[PDB]
Amino acid sequence: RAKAKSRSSRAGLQFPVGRVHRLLRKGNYAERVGAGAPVYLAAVLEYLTAEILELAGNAARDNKKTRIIPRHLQLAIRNDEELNKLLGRVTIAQGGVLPNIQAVLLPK
Amino acid sequence: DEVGALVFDIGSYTVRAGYAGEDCPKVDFPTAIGMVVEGPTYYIDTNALRVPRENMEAISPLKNGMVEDWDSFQAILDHTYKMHVKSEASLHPVLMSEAPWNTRAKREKLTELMFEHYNIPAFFLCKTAVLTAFANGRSTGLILDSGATHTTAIPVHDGYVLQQGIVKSPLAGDFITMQCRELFQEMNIELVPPYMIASKEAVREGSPANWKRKEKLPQVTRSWHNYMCNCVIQDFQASVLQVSDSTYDEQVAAQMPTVHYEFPNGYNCDFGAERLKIPEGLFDPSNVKGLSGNTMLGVSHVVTTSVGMCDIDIRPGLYGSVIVAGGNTLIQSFTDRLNRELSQKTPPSMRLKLIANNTTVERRFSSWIGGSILASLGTFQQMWISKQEYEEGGKQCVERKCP
Amino acid sequence: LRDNIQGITKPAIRRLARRGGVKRISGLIYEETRGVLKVFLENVIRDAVTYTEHAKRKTVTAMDVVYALKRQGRTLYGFGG
Amino acid sequence: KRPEGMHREVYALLYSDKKKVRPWKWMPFTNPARKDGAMFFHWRRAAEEGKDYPFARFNKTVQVPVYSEQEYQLYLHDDAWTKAETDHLFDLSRRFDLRFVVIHDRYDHQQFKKRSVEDLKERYYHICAKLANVRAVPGTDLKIPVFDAGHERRRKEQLERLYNRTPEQVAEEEYLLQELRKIEARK
Amino acid sequence: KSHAEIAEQAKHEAEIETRIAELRKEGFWSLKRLPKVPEPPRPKGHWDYLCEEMQWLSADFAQERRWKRGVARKVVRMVIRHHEEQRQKEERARREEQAKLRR
Amino acid sequence: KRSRKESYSVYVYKVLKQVHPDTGISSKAMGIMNSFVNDIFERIAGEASRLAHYNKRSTITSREIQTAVRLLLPGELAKHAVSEGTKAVTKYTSSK
Numbered sequence: 001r002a003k004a005k006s007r008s009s010r011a012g013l014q015f016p017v018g019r020v021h022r023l024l025r026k027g028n029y030a031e032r033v034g035a036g037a038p039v040y041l042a043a044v045l046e047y048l049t050a051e052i053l054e055l056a057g058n059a060a061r062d063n064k065k066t067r068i069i070p071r072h073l074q075l076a077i078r079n080d081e082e083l084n085k086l087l088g089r090v091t092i093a094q095g096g097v098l099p100n101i102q103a104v105l106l107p108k
Numbered sequence: 109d110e111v112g113a114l115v116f117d118i119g120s121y122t123v124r125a126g127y128a129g130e131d132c133p134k135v136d137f138p139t140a141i142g143m144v145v146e147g148p149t150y151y152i153d154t155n156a157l158r159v160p161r162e163n164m165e166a167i168s169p170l171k172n173g174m175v176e177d178w179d180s181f182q183a184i185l186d187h188t189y190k191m192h193v194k195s196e197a198s199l200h201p202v203l204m205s206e207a208p209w210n211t212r213a214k215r216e217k218l219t220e221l222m223f224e225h226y227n228i229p230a231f232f233l234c235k236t237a238v239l240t241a242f243a244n245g246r247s248t249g250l251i252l253d254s255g256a257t258h259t260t261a262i263p264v265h266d267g268y269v270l271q272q273g274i275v276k277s278p279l280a281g282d283f284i285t286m287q288c289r290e291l292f293q294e295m296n297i298e299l300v301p302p303y304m305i306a307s308k309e310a311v312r313e314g315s316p317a318n319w320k321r322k323e324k325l326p327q328v329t330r331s332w333h334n335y336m337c338n339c340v341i342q343d344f345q346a347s348v349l350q351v352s353d354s355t356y357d358e359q360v361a362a363q364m365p366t367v368h369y370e371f372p373n374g375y376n377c378d379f380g381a382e383r384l385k386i387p388e389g390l391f392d393p394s395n396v397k398g399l400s401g402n403t404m405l406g407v408s409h410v411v412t413t414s415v416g417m418c419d420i421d422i423r424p425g426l427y428g429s430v431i432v433a434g435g436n437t438l439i440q441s442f443t444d445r446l447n448r449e450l451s452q453k454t455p456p457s458m459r460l461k462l463i464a465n466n467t468t469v470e471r472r473f474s475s476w477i478g479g480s481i482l483a484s485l486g487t488f489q490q491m492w493i494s495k496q497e498y499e500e501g502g503k504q505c506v507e508r509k510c511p
Numbered sequence: 512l513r514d515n516i517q518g519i520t521k522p523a524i525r526r527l528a529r530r531g532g533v534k535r536i537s538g539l540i541y542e543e544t545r546g547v548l549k550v551f552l553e554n555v556i557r558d559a560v561t562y563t564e565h566a567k568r569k570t571v572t573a574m575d576v577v578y579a580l581k582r583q584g585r586t587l588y589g590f591g592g
Numbered sequence: 593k594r595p596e597g598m599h600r601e602v603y604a605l606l607y608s609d610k611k612k613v614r615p616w617k618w619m620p621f622t623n624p625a626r627k628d629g630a631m632f633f634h635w636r637r638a639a640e641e642g643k644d645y646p647f648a649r650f651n652k653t654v655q656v657p658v659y660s661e662q663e664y665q666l667y668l669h670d671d672a673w674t675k676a677e678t679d680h681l682f683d684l685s686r687r688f689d690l691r692f693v694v695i696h697d698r699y700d701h702q703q704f705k706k707r708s709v710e711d712l713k714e715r716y717y718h719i720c721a722k723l724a725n726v727r728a729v730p731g732t733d734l735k736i737p738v739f740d741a742g743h744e745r746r747r748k749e750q751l752e753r754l755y756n757r758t759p760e761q762v763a764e765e766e767y768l769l770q771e772l773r774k775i776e777a778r779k
Numbered sequence: 780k781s782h783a784e785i786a787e788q789a790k791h792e793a794e795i796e797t798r799i800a801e802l803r804k805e806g807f808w809s810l811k812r813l814p815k816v817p818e819p820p821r822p823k824g825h826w827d828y829l830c831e832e833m834q835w836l837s838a839d840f841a842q843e844r845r846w847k848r849g850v851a852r853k854v855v856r857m858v859i860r861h862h863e864e865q866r867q868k869e870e871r872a873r874r875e876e877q878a879k880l881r882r
Numbered sequence: 883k884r885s886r887k888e889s890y891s892v893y894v895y896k897v898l899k900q901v902h903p904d905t906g907i908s909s910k911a912m913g914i915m916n917s918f919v920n921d922i923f924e925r926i927a928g929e930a931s932r933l934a935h936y937n938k939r940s941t942i943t944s945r946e947i948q949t950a951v952r953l954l955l956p957g958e959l960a961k962h963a964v965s966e967g968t969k970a971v972t973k974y975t976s977s978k
């Protein structure tokens with residue numbers, strides 16, 4: 001047959017469209033899944049991941065570190081306005097918190 | 109990078125000529141051709157060959173991958189040029205295959221015959237093992253070629269053959285044809301070639317053949333008759349024979365489904381263990397009657413001896429790049445039995461792996477595909493022995509220009 | 512086991528409060544924090560053991576804890592493979 | 593009325609959420625990498641007619657020194673090696689890209705006594721080293737790392753003794769398993 | 780002692796003796812694996828160029844073969860669907876007749 | 883006898899390296915990242931399933947996924963993700 005092309009490469013994404021479609025079709029989500037749903041889902045997930053990774057890398061460079069650690073993830077999430085709202089009810093292990101000291105508890 | 113050339117693979121069974129860069133040869137025609145003094149004439153494509161014609165004469169142009177009759181070889185070349193290639197030789201280089209055991213004398217004689225008779229602009233003579241390796245995609249490995257005349261294991265290292273590591277055995281298509289002949293004579297099967305049959309009728313299994321002989325058959329020599337009979341026997345081989353998975357056991361062979369086959373004369377019958385007992389000699393000649401000799405080496409024995417006669421440092425590469433090729437390798441379960449025996453006999457310290465080039469085109473035309481992809485390379489454009497090279501260095505320049 | 516809630520000492524609770532931003536801590540805050548942590552662990556481990564028993568397993572895996580935290584609303588990354 | 597006119601999925605997603613001259617020619621050409629001036633042919637374009645052969649860069653033959661008659665007679669003299677043999681060895685080295693496993697097979701045993709691979713390699717390296725050790729001015733190659741042949745002979749012998757051992761492999765593996773067993777027991 | 784552990788110790792000593800014998804025979808580990816291998820590669824080798832392009836074009840033909848037999852395959856294929864579409868074209872004309880019937 | 887478990891680490895690292903050539907990521911950060919991917923996948927797929935069930939449809943489509951993304955993602959992230967998904971669904975159906 002012709003050289004097989006993957007759906008992820010065809011669309012222009014990196015996340016596994018095949019595995020996303022497998023999960024969607026065998027899961028509780030629906031009886032059968034259309035070809036466009038998993039592509040869209042994988043694209044959205046890839047975009048969220050790219051955004052959070054950019055923020056984490058920025059935090060890492062700020063802290064003078066080459067490896068993104070959960071600190072750089074927690075700081076990124078709690079510094080970003082929209083990602084914070086997205087992951088408000090999500091805790092990250094070994095991520096820590098922000099140095100948000102109330103102005104009322106400072107030396108006077 | 110690509111240049112219009114001519115790739116030739118002249119084996120003892122078939123000759124494959126074509127252009128460099130194609131996945132398949134332009135024309136493949138048997139090598140065991142006849143001869144008729146019309147002077148001596150020769151044929152190609154099997155349609156001018158398998159014809160009942162007055163006074164069919166014997167001839168053997170090339171045996172064991174080496175030229176046996178230079179006149180018949182030149183005639184075959186001329187016919188391949190003017191009949192099927194249909195192009196002047198001076199317009200296309202020539203990359204021709206040769207057996208590793210070819211002699212320097214035959215090499216130089218072929219070079220001078222190609223440079224002074226056809227006036228080809230460039231010439232190259234490559235070994236069948238190197239060509240098979242280049243086709244299969246490996247520069248180091250053991251090429252196992254089981255042709256019509258011999259079964260040979262040839263170790264190639266970095267694109268060069270190690271003569272001291274080569275091993276050969278006479279158990280080949282000729283041995284298989286002899287065994288089929290003996291089986292037919294034992295089962296009382298009259299081997300009738302097609303050219304002797306005018307008409308036939310359908311008869312029950314195992315019953316005598318009801319066929320009529322032609323009334324105006326021409327004069328044909330015993331050699332041509334044996335050639336037709338060997339063609340029929342090779343058809344029977346390709347349609348019936350099968351290699352045993354494990355060492356031949358009569359009890360296990362008597363529990364295998366039979367294979368039905370009908371000869372040209374209409375005699376049709378089923379074969380049971382006799383079709384699996386013949387191909388066993390290729391791997392174990394000790395159980396073959398009429399072969400009272402233990403010095404003969406089976407396929408696995410040849411492989412192991414060829415690997416052992418090489419430097420221990422390269423044996424891992426040979427075991428890991430063992431390449432299987434040849435016409436006899438198309439027999440069912442042949443490569444399975446080979447892999448089993450090699451895994452049993454090879455030290456586990458060295459990884460064993462056989463290339464899966466099991467297709468008919470990949471197997472029988474491996475030596476030609478190799479030359480095609482080797483001549484279709486820009487790098488290879490510097491290894492061409494030019495007409496000027498021949499004129500300046502003479503016939504002996506071949507040994508230095510193409511090992 | 513017994514009285515292992517006392518394995519959360521005043522220095523540990525004071526470090527947990529420092530990480531939350533508290534500057535000055537009272538005396539009964541430590542008891543209140545122990546009681547709250549115990550109530551939270553009770554529900555989390557009850558959900559985990561409910562996910563475990565149902566699986567006929569004898570070991571509480573990390574996925575059980577993850578699912579319990581998701582049920583309780585505390586989605587936890589870093590332990591989901 | 594619905595405009596649409598495009599693909600169903602893309603359409604729903606978008607709206608539901610609002611002078612010829614350049615003939616190829618069979619041109620001849622010469623490869624500058626060759627010294628015989630052999631002329632070949634190729635289907636080149638109409639732009640790079642007469643341009644240098646692009647693959648000509650692939651002509652970096654292996655580096656092998658070339659001793660002279662006087663140099664050989666003076667320094668490379670060896671009682672167990674003659675010119676007839678050393679010149680042939682160097683020719684094979686130059687021809688087959690310095691691979692001794694193949695040089696040994698291409699060796700001319702009909703005119704010279706049989707040789708192994710290690711002796712040939714040692715001879716070649718000793719020649720290369722002695723040719724340059726005559727003076728310190730040569731900068732191309734002065735201290736050629738002559739490989740070890742003594743230890744190589746052992747590495748060959750006590751490994752060929754292991755290669756063709758049929759049941760000894762299983763025996764050694766079993767005793768090694770037992771060895772680890774009781775060693776862990778005595779740890 | 781355990782009237783058995785000493786027997787196990789004697790068995791281990793016999794094993795040690797047998798291993799000493801096997802070592803005197805052929806050894807257990809060929810130490811000094813390629814210690815002195817100073818073979819210096821050429822500036823570029825120049826033979827990897829051939830091997831590199833060799834791998835480049837070798838897989839190409841193998842790929843082009845599977846692609847070609849796949850391409851010609853799907854060609855003769857839509858050929859069958861086309862002929863089927865001609866019989867299916869007559870069936871669609873029959874369906875149009877039935878649609879006129881329905882109208 | 884292998885018990886191989888899948889993950890998104892092979893593509894999370896590809897995107898990472900394409901959006902930041904010089905920056906790497908640790909194993910714990912990769913695990914948290916895969917957890918985030920799984921969580922948002924579950925969220926969006928469940929929202930699309932809910933939309934389908936509300937519209938009385940047994941199949942989820944790109945339109946259901948688009949409305950689910952619009953509902954889930956907040957403000958100026960929703961628009962970005964939706965434009966990305968739309969552009970991908972149009973570059974995928976164009977046979978490129």
Ligand SMILES: Nc1ncnc2c1ncn2[C@@H]1O[C@H](COP(=O)(O)OP(=O)(O)OP(=O)(O)O)[C@@H](O)[C@H]1O
Pocket residue numbers: 118119120121122123171172173254255256257258280281282284342345346434435436437438439472
């Ligand atoms: N389809 C087939 N099945 C089994 N055997 C076959 C088949 N086709 C050919 N053979 C066997 O292949 C042999 C010849 O094949 P091959 O072309 O490899 O020989 P060759 O290499 O050209 O010449 P030589 O064997 O002299 O080198 C014949 O002996 C024939 O019996």
